[PDB]
Amino acid sequence: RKESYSIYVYKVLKQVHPDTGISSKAMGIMNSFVNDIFERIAGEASRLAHYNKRSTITSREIQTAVRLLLPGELAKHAVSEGTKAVTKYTSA
DNA sequence: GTGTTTGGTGTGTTTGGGTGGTGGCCGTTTTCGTTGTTTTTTTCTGTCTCGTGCCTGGTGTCTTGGGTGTTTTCCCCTTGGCGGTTTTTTCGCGGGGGTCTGCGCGTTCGTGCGTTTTTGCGGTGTAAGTACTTGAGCTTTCTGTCT
Structure with missing residues (x-):
């Protein structure tokens, strides 16, 4: 399966x-x-974490990775969506 | 333009087999309390980048000469293109065979995790003689007493 x-x-x-x-x-x-x-984003987040000597991958790492990989408006809207979703989720 | 006339999009009916929808279930996402820690927070030192200031002259840069090399034109000589005909093999379906990839079961030895040992790597705890000072001994005078 x-x-x-x-x-x-x-x-x-x-x-x-x-x-x-x-x-x-x-x-x-x-x-x-x-x-x-998925693999582009996760890999960038991993690099970011290692560079800053951090052991957790949090929403900040992901957001920055998105900003680094997605070009222009793709990034702006993806960031908006991701922020909206994590906001809605934390406040349940 | 007028004109034929090969290529291509629109139209219709028919087939089917491949996507969508549903039942069954199991395995993976979660609901929960607890542990332990990787944050985050603040407060510190004190590095390093920004800011300005002066002087030199390497560099930029505005400008005249000019010449050469790019842009266009004319001509060619040829080698891809379009078409017709023959060849043939790519491809399709069917059948047969076997290899090797995947599941499952058993394990052992290889690596992670630990206390521990350790070298590199780096910080810094004799006899003289002279000059000067100091302590013991006795003067003046002045202040109190006292006949």
Whole structure:
């Protein structure tokens, strides 16, 4: 039962485009994409942590990594989204 | 332009097989209290970067000469392109065989974690003779007494 991001990418698609489906080949592309972005961000956060002699990866490390990797408006909106989500989550 | 006339998008009906939706369940996310620590916080020292100031002259830079090398034009000679025909092998489906990749079960020895030992690496705890000083001995005078 080798695990994947499929259910979520289909949930998000159904939210943004209720009448649009997804081929298996394109679904594979999305899984690869998610995995790749995950590894870019986590790796940058790891480097940041090591440089500053810290042992925990917190939201600050992730935010900075996002700012370093995502170009322009992609970064600005991603940061907004991430901040909104961690705000909503802490205040439950 | 007028004109034919090969290429390409729009239209319709038909097929199917591949995506979406649902049932079953199990394994992974969580709800909880406790531990232990990696933060964060404040307060310290005191490094290093910013700021200014003066003087020198290496460098920048404005400008005249000019010449050469880039831009365009004319001509060519040729080598890719488009087409027709023949070749052939890529590819498709089916069948057969075997290797080797993955699960599971058993373990042993290899590494992490610890107390401990240690070298490098680095901080700094004799006999003389002269000059000077000091302590013992006795003067003046002045102040009190006293006939």
